[PDB]
Amino acid sequence: AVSKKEVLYFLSSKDAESSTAVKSYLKSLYAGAQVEATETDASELIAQLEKKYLSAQVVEPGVHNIALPLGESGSAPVKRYAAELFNLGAQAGFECPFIEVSKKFGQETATSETVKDVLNKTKSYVSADYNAALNEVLSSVEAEINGPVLFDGKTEGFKKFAAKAKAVAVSRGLPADTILAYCAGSANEDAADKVSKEFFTWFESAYTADAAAEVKAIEAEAASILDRHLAKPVAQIRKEQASAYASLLKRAETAKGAKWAEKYLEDVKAVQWFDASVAEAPASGPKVAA
Amino acid sequence: ADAKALDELRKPKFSSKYLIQHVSQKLIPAVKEWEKSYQP
Amino acid sequence: LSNERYQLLSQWPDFTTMYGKDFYYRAHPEDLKKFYDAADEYYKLYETVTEFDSLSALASQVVPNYAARRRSTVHPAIGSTVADGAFTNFLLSKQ
Amino acid sequence: KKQATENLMKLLQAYKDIGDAKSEPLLKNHNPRTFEDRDYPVPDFRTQNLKAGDVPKFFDTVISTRASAAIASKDKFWAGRKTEAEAASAKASAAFPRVAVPE
């Protein structure tokens, strides 16, 4: 059963095993069961850890339900794949990726006075091809002041760095004037409309190029896994795979009583139903209850 | 036997979801007993 | 992908047209060992490219590393180009 | 590997053309008896100072030297036949039928 904080996370979720846990919970509440009071407890560090591990139970069956657009031509399979992961972010409680990674910046650098310590605590989230181009330009503005460039904004020594880092950001290809004019806004709704149409033209060309770089790495991983496997004789392949299949079954049979190992071996019985339901009618496929 | 369902057949099979649940069922109740008992 | 490799085993020359004994005895005895080894090699390549029941276990070597990259603590759909372009909103604004 | 197999099949065609041009027998050059010199000066055991048990070991090393010199003369034929066919497999046709695989 679910712990009533999982089932609040699975309401806007749309995978199968989470909706049938919701639907049997809503069928219990139709038969007069009391909805248990959700906890007004679990302080700021424990609340961010439950949100970390309940979002990952919405993301994990959702990622396995998104077909990769491997070996497709065009942007719309890559835009479908990116839109399904956007919607998986919203179903799991994430915001927009722009609003969720900039929250990661301002959280990791809450205590930063100099921008060299910004550029070292946001190292995991910024590309090293871009972290280096902001560190080389930093040491030139460090050469003009011969004092550490501050994370102040009011400082004029930062204002000449922010005009040099804007020259770096346009060199990568990303419009730093359009990005800044979106998250700041404007007064009228007509001049803010044209900059949102120009941010979302960058943003869609941004997240497509992250999805397409993810597809081009799965395509390159699968093509090197296959070409290594096609160089084996077929007798080696069948026993390398039967050794890997049997070792991975035994790890789920060593684990007794665990919920994951009970569900692992129950899905092995559901794959063998799929192979057996196809053998009865192969022009029809698997037989669904209809 | 035959003809399972549709909502039984829409489940992704070898996802984690239950290692993530088994970890959070043994990390969240084990860390509430860390902040309630914490002095440096 | 296994089709693109099978399509170039479709273009292999029919070596069994040179199996007769008028090719056995005209040929150098070491260029006939190589010819009979290049025919045994094609059956090694062809019997493994048509092992299509092994492609399902090869797909499970791609899944778990992909699925862990989607369990990002930031977002499932995050990438470098978005997180770089959202650094200039963070850096080129005031503090 | 497809080009190595086309090179081997073009070589094995070049062996068959320059053998059928010379109209030579099939088993002649693979038989090392045909490269044996029967007009060899055939050493006399009566001029080699053999003792009592030494004559059959003299006969074996006159035979095995003459069989090895016929085998090594067969190898010198085929090493010269190879370069005659390696230089005609280069200027060749390579119109071979393909292996029937299902489409």
Side-chain angles (χ1 to χ4, degrees), chain C residues 22-39:
Chain C
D22 49 351
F23 289 99
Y24 189 104
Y25 285 121
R26 294 292 196 223
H28 188 118
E30 293 294 327
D31 299 342
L32 198 79
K33 303 289 194 296
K34 287 169 188 168
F35 176 74
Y36 281 3
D37 280 356

Side-chain angles (χ1 to χ4, degrees), chain A residues 52 59-60 63-64 68 81 85-86 89 94-95 97-98 100-101 104-106 109 118 122 125-127 130 134 151-152 158 162 165-166 169 172 174 176 179-180 183 202-203 206-207 210 214 218 221 223 225-227 229-232 234 237-238 241, chain C residues 1-6 9 43-95:
Chain A
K52 193 205 194 187
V59 162
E60 267 296 313
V63 158
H64 288 237
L68 272 158
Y81 168 64
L85 291 172
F86 263 74
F94 297 96
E95 309 170 10
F98 207 92
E100 202 88 12
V101 78
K104 210 75 176 187
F105 293 151
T109 60
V118 171
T122 55
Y125 313 103
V126 187
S127 177
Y130 190 47
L134 293 186
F151 204 41
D152 178 37
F158 179 76
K166 187 175 299 179
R172 319 283 289 177
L174 53 95
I179 292 167
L180 280 165
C183 284
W202 167 78
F203 187 51
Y207 67 72
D210 310 291
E214 188 62 79
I218 295 300
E221 167 169 21
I225 278 177
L226 182 75
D227 294 351
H229 155 275
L230 289 186
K232 300 184 211 304
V234 83
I237 288 174
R238 301 208 186 103
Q241 290 187 345
Chain C
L1 276 188
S2 187
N3 199 354
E4 303 184 7
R5 321 281 197 268
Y6 175 97
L9 298 186
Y43 302 135
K44 192 194 72 60
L45 307 178
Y46 188 77
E47 291 189 320
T48 180
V49 87
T50 63
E51 187 68 35
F52 302 121
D53 281 2
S54 292
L55 295 186
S56 174
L58 286 190
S60 295
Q61 307 177 4
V62 190
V63 168
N65 278 327
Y66 166 83
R69 285 181 45 88
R70 292 305 105 182
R71 282 194 305 272
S72 183
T73 61
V74 181
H75 196 92
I78 202 56
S80 290
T81 315
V82 168
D84 288 358
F87 200 56
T88 70
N89 194 256
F90 175 76
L91 203 66
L92 312 191
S93 311
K94 54 189 72 63
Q95 75 262 12

Side-chain angles (χ1 to χ4, degrees), chain A residues 45 99 117 130 147 191 223 258:
Chain A
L45 281 178
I99 317 177
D117 187 65
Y130 190 47

Side-chain angles (χ1 to χ4, degrees), chain A:
Chain A
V2 292
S3 176
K4 206 258 161 184
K5 216 169 188 180
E6 312 191 344
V7 82
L8 297 168
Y9 248 114
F10 299 163
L11 293 192
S12 181
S13 172
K14 285 180 175 297
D15 66 282
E17 74 257 58
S18 91
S19 72
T20 63
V22 162
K23 284 184 167 192
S24 69
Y25 178 79
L26 268 295
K27 273 164 57 182
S28 176
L29 299 187
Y30 187 71
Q34 291 303 118
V35 47
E36 198 276 336
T38 179
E39 301 294 324
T40 165
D41 204 356
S43 69
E44 185 183 1
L45 281 178
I46 321 289
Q48 295 301 107
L49 195 71
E50 286 181 351
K51 262 204 60 180
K52 193 205 194 187
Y53 278 82
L54 285 171
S55 295
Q57 304 171 42
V58 183
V59 162
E60 267 296 313
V63 158
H64 288 237
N65 264 321
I66 295 164
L68 272 158
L70 299 180
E72 310 261 330
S73 79
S75 53
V78 192
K79 282 185 197 177
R80 189 270 315 159
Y81 168 64
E84 283 199 289
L85 291 172
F86 263 74
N87 300 10
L88 183 56
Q91 283 158 30
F94 297 96
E95 309 170 10
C96 181
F98 207 92
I99 317 177
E100 202 88 12
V101 78
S102 63
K103 175 174 56 198
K104 210 75 176 187
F105 293 151
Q107 164 195 325
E108 288 290 330
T109 60
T111 58
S112 297
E113 289 89 10
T114 178
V115 316
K116 195 265 291 180
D117 187 65
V118 171
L119 265 290
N120 282 114
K121 273 195 300 191
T122 55
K123 226 200 173 199
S124 295
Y125 313 103
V126 187
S127 177
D129 202 4
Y130 190 47
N131 191 89
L134 293 186
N135 274 343
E136 294 292 324
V137 150
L138 172 63
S139 295
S140 70
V141 186
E142 190 80 17
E144 296 296 325
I145 307 301
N146 205 302
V149 183
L150 293 192
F151 204 41
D152 178 37
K154 301 174 186 290
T155 300
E156 201 273 330
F158 179 76
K159 293 175 226 291
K160 61 176 71 66
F161 166 61
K164 287 293 295 298
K166 187 175 299 179
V168 170
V170 299
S171 177
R172 319 283 289 177
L174 53 95
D177 305 320
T178 307
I179 292 167
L180 280 165
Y182 180 75
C183 284
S186 166
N188 42 358
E189 79 177 286
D190 287 329
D193 181 88
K194 67 100 178 176
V195 63
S196 75
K197 286 169 61 98
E198 195 177 3
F199 170 75
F200 287 148
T201 295
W202 167 78
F203 187 51
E204 192 185 35
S205 72
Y207 67 72
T208 304
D210 310 291
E214 188 62 79
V215 168
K216 286 303 168 165
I218 295 300
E219 287 184 8
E221 167 169 21
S224 73
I225 278 177
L226 182 75
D227 294 351
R228 185 182 323 126
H229 155 275
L230 289 186
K232 300 184 211 304
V234 83
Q236 179 182 167
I237 288 174
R238 301 208 186 103
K239 68 173 292 298
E240 268 190 338
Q241 290 187 345
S243 172
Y245 172 81
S247 175
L248 264 290
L249 265 182
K250 190 172 69 68
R251 200 177 316 167
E253 288 165 350
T254 296
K256 290 279 101 177
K259 191 49 189 304
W260 73 265
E262 182 180 2
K263 286 298 194 184
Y264 203 91
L265 307 175
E266 190 176 358
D267 291 315
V268 181
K269 289 190 286 185
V271 170
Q272 294 164 6
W273 176 90
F274 197 94
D275 295 334
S277 177
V278 163
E280 306 162 349
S284 166
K287 190 184 284 185
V288 308

